[PDB]
Design an enzyme around this catalytic site. Structure first.
Site: not given
Ligand SMILES: Nc1ncnc2c1ncn2[C@@H]1O[C@H](COP(=O)(O)OP(=O)(O)NP(=O)(O)O)[C@@H](O)[C@H]1O
Ligand SMILES: [Cl-]
Ligand SMILES: [Mg+2]
Length: 317
Positions: A23, A24-25, A152
């Site tokens: 949308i 790389g984890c 947070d």
């Molecule tokens: N359920 C979801 N649906 C859509 N997008 C999502 C969802 N969960 C996370 N994301 C988005 O995917 C991106 C990466 O997510 P995540 O790694 O969990 O967040 P983070 O650790 O707080 N920030 P970062 O690692 O810097 O991107 C962010 O821009 C989120 O808003």
């Protein structure tokens, strides 16, 4: 990459899912079918190594407090339109190249609020801020009643419902904290297992003081978010590499809320509900239960003041 494209993965409840593009984890995901996973996917799959602490923490939060029926029963009982807590849809374990991963399925959301804020020249209107905050207050009440604090809250952790832009959801529970395990409130001290202190510009005075976060801290974080969203700034934003400066400012501004309103808002032109919310949060003891309806009533008076009402309209774009 953790998955092969179009791979079928089966969760611990034996529900089958199909993996799509990142949308790389984090990948787009959908229920298993002949069809390929498209850009319109209703789900996402988050995947991390098995030893990853935040995904385990987050998964425990979703399993304990975000089961679809416990969320729906709350919505019905509290007579809410919706609840911005993402639902838990499943989880499991997945092997790849002799390495063990954990995955979790959750709903796909739309844009984060930080992007909409930045496109609107770092401002949200008074109507938007009050509408966001009423929903965040419902979310906080829910997670607090389920023994957790978020610690947070910020625009980048707030996502819109992919199909309804008037519905905001609070995400990221990787560092959420169970402040009340089995109804026993944690003591005014640091948690040895817990390291993190949130986002420096928004974090609570409790967090700055090196103690575990509690309910008043999440409400204080929402307070700094409101000012930031309404004005585009916070008084300590140029000194974020100095936590003792950020804490000193927060302490001095909590002690004299009127000087914070004088600093942040054009001279003698501050929205009154913000100062009233902050004075209310200031009266909470570390372990005290907030009176959420009272806080929501303070914001509703603010909507009345601008000749509006709680119609659930975020007024984004
Ligand atoms: N359920 C979801 N649906 C859509 N997008 C999502 C969802 N969960 C996370 N994301 C988005 O995917 C991106 C990466 O997510 P995540 O790694 O969990 O967040 P983070 O650790 O707080 N920030 P970062 O690692 O810097 O991107 C962010 O821009 C989120 O808003
Ligand atoms: Cl500006
Ligand atoms: Mg996230």
């Amino acid at each position: 990459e953790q998955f092969a494209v179009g791979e079928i993965i089966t969760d611990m409840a034996a529900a089958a899912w199909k993996v799509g593009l990142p949308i790389g984890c984090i990948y787009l995901a959908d229920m298993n079918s002949s069809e390929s996973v498209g850009s319109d996917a209703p789900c996402v799959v988050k995947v991390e190594p098995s030893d990853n602490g935040p995904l385990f923490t987050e998964l425990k939060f979703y399993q304990r407090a975000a089961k679809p029926e416990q969320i729906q029963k709350w919505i019905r009982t509290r007579k809410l339109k919706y609840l911005g807590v993402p639902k838990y849809w499943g989880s499991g374990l997945h092997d790849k190249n002799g390495k063990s991963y954990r995955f979790m399925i959750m709903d796909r959301f739309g844009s984060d609020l930080q992007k909409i804020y930045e496109a609107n020249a770092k401002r949200f209107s008074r109507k938007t801020v009050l509408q966001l905050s009423l929903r965040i207050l419902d979310i906080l009440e829910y997670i607090h009643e389920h023994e957790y604090v978020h610690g947070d809250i910020k625009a980048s952790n707030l996502l819109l419902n992919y199909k309804n832009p008037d519905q905001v959801y609070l995400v990221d529970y990787g560092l959420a904290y169970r402040y009340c395990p089995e109804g026993v409130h944690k003591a005014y001290a640091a948690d040895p297992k817990r390291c993190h202190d949130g986002t420096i510009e928004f974090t609570s005075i409790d967090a700055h003081n090196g103690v575990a976060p509690s309910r008043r801290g999440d409400l204080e974080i929402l307070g700094y978010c409101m000012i930031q969203w309404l004005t585009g700034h916070l008084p300590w934003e140029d000194n974020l590499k100095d936590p003792k400066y950020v804490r000193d400012s927060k302490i001095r501004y909590r002690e004299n809320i009127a000087s914070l309103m004088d600093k942040c808002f054009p001279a003698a032109n501050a929205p009154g509900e913000i100062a009233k919310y902050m004075e209310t949060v200031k009266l909470l003891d570390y372990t005290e239960k907030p009176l959420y309806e009272n806080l929501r009533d303070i914001l509703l008076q603010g909507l009345k003041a601008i000749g509006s009402k709680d119609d659930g309209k975020l007024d984004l774009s």
